[PDB]
Swiss-Prot record, chain A:
Name by which UniProt lists this protein: DNA-directed RNA polymerase subunit beta'
Lineage: Bacteria, Thermotogati, Deinococcota, Deinococci, Thermales
Main function: DNA-dependent RNA polymerase catalyzes the transcription of DNA into RNA using the four ribonucleoside triphosphates as substrates.
Family statement drawn from the similarity comment of this UniProt entry: Belongs to the RNA polymerase beta' chain family.
Subunit relationships: The RNAP catalytic core consists of 2 alpha, 1 beta, 1 beta' and 1 omega subunit. When a sigma factor is associated with the core the holoenzyme is formed, which can initiate transcription.
From Swiss-Prot, chain B:
Record-annotated membrane-spanning stretches: none
Function: Sigma factors are initiation factors that promote the attachment of RNA polymerase to specific initiation sites and are then released. This sigma factor is the primary sigma factor during exponential growth.
Record note on domains: Contains 4 domains, connected by flexible linkers. In the active conformation, the domains are in an extended conformation, each making extensive interactions with the RNA polymerase catalytic core.
The protein's assembly and partners: Interacts transiently with the RNA polymerase catalytic core formed by RpoA, RpoB, RpoC and RpoZ (2 alpha, 1 beta, 1 beta' and 1 omega subunit) to form the RNA polymerase holoenzyme that can initiate transcription.
Annotated organism of origin: Thermus aquaticus
Family: Belongs to the sigma-70 factor family. RpoD/SigA subfamily.
Name of the molecule in the record: RNA polymerase sigma factor SigA
Full-sequence portion shown in this chain: 94 to 207 of 438
Region named Sigma-70 factor domain-1: 1-35
Subcellular location: Cytoplasm
Length: 157, 114
């Protein structure tokens, strides 16, 4: 069982009446109390990408090829759009309700603060674990040891 | 009785699963190639380092004290080689242990198919 790492720098739009307000959120660490089911407001146009992560979601906004932005949907912040579907600016991207805590497999490092009125933007550098399994056969022999830290393009077995 | 004796002595060890077999040949050949890579390091013979491995594995001074009244000098042509290959970096060092365990597995294979 190889648990890999995934790094992404993503933004978030949540009001200021919520914002649990921390520089580091552990898995399951509560984020953004809110009030009412805030509608995530797209700050860019493009086509989306819905990459489902455990409880949480991730929206990649790109025009043609290149990415225009990346958004993070905390647990309970629900997607209003289908992957690849064309969206616009200010469009109702997603909806959080109440709690909307941090995902259970993911961390948060190096928070950010952009605050305007009742709302605030937070750019979080997020890294998680996206594990995968490999079935070994008698035609194989494991090389790397148990609980080892593997590189990129590493001979495992 | 030596007859039942041998049979029971070989009946003291399990055979091998297909896995164990493939793995055996694998590690064995990894040791046999390891020695070959050692010959390219300290600049010794293919069989020299080879036998000298058994000199620390197959036993102590019992392996070279009776292959006949003459085989090859134990304190001279070997002991110098047991220390000549002893000072090498981490790069070359592992290829020694691969020779010890690699050549070791050979015996397991034989005992198995016995």
């Amino acid at each position: 069982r190889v648990d890999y790492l995934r790094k992404e720098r993503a933004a978030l739009r949540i009001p200021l009446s919520a914002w649990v307000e921390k520089e580091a959120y552990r898995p399951g660490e509560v984020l953004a109390e809110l009030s009412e089911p805030y509608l995530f407001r797209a700050e860019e146009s493009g086509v989306v990408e819905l990459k489902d992560l455990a409880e949480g979601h991730l929206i990649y906004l790109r025009q043609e090829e290149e990415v225009v932005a990346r958004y993070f949907l905390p647990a309970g912040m629900t997607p209003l759009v289908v992957e690849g579907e064309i969206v616009e600016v200010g469009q109702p991207l997603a909806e959080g309700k109440g709690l909307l805590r941090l995902p259970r497999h993911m961390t948060a490092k190096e928070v950010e603060a952009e605050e305007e009125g009742d709302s605030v933007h937070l750019t979080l550098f997020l890294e998680w674990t996206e594990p995968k399994d490999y079935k070994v056969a008698p035609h194989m022999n494991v090389i790397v040891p148990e609980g080892a830290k593997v590189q990129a393009g590493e001979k495992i077995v | 009785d030596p007859v039942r004796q041998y049979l029971h002595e070989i009946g003291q060890v399990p055979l091998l699963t297909l896995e164990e077999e493939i793995d055996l040949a694998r590690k064995v050949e990894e040791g046999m190639e390891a020695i070959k890579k050692l010959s390219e390091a300290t600049g010794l013979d293919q069989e020299l380092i080879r036998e000298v491995v058994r000199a620390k594995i197959l036993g102590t001074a019992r392996i070279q004290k009776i292959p006949g009244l003459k085989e090859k000098p134990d304190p001279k042509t070997v002991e110098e080689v047991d220390g000549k290959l002893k000072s090498l970096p981490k790069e070359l060092k592992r290829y020694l242990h691969i020779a010890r365990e690699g050549e070791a597995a050979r015996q397991h294979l034989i005992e198995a198919n016995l």
